[PDB]
Design a protein around this ligand. Structure first.
Ligand SMILES: [Mg+2]
Ligand SMILES: [Mg+2]
Lengths: 213, 270
């Protein structure tokens, strides 16, 4: 299983050297799959399924590029929204949640940041609403075990015979290991030196890039 | 039920007042007085009770805030207000800190005599519309390059009431950076004990003879009680009915508004 941002490419985007020739379980939510795949398993379709099953109608706190994936709100769906994380948009999501009988916040990933310099990801804004509303988000995407399992099922491979490759030490590496996989940390993308000596997560191996992997 | 109000308010010589949600609710064109609160302040000033405003207000400078309130009819001077910006400025000076200011323009004047150039920390306040992704990201990028990252937050409130509904305050954006950077903010303002103590010292009243009146069950009420004061929760401002049955904080009393609090104080307090 291959992470995309920080492994194949960095958005902005630009291919990481050696990664095109070296060649997917992604939390990408700024762009639809079609748009991402054009630029080159994702959380939006898995979210769509969960919404349908529960009669949930989302207020979408998202980037315009992923809106296609969701083609009287009773929950909020928050993604890697970037510039769309205006105060107006955040406040509107907040005010929706604060009027619900049963407030539900669905988050597409919980990454802290990604490399582009370093950029704030969905996670910090997820935490803002959790604190503001006094609720816990449901995370669809990595490191949720159902996300990894769906990606494994798509290729017909069990966890003990699979390896995840990623730049996010907790989200990718820790997450995959928790599901019974092996996992490798790349030193491209969001990687910082401390991630190789992380107090909680010891990757099964550390590699400079996808090519070395 | 509750102990008699006369027991509950016995010995109170001083009053710390929250502003937003207690005197007024902010909004476009200077906000709106809460009914009965202008006259309640007047009645307090006339009494022998000592009065201090203990506010986390950080969207506007004290001069601007005090101007807005005076224009609504309040009897209030800058000398009577304890607010976070000056306390933050003192701390920045004592530690050689130079802040990147994640703030509304209206409070920028408060930091006029601080060097923000070559910033070695971030100060986050109630920034409202200025919580753009760009500004949040810039603050984030400043913190991530620092050897020793320091985040100073002017309050940690979740939300406050405004004319346009409940609004996201400083706290949620504080929590965002804490998560993004992997650090804990230093909170200057309520409910930090030093903040309440500075306000008590300004009026020469000890905590066991003081009462805090506020709309924020954790920040105002829980905070004050943790410093040894009594505290009353108002039902105006950001108050929701679940706040009267809060699992952690049991206010010393609940009142509909400042007017009711003042009726009770002048009836039962010193
Ligand atoms: Mg990645
Ligand atoms: Mg208040």
């Amino acid at each position: 299983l291959l992470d995309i941002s920080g492994v194949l490419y960095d958005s902005g985007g630009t291919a990481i050297a050696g990664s095109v020739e070296a060649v997917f379980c992604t939390n990408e939510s700024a762009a639809s799959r079609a748009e991402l795949v054009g630029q080159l398993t994702a959380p939006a379709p898995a979210a769509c399924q969960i919404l349908k099953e529960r009669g949930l109608r989302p207020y979408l706190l998202i980037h315009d590029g992923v809106r296609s994936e969701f083609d009287n709100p009773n929950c909020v769906v928050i993604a890697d929204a970037g510039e769309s994380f205006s105060y107006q948009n955040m406040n509107n999501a907040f005010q929706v949640l604060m009027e619900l009988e049963k407030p539900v916040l669905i988050s597409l990933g919980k990454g802290r940041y990604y490399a582009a310099g370093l950029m704030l990801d969905v996670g910090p804004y997820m935490k803002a609403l959790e604190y503001a509303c006094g609720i816990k988000a449901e995370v669809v995407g990595k490191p949720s075990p159902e996300f990894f399992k769906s990606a494994l099922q798509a290729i017909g491979v069990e966890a003990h015979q699979a390896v995840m490759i990623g730049d996010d030490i907790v989200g990718d590496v820790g997450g995959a290991q928790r599901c019974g996989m092996r996992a490798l940390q790349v030193r491209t993308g969001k990687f910082r030196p401390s991630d190789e000596h992380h107090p909680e997560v010891k990757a099964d191996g550390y590699v400079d890039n996808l090519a070395e992997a």
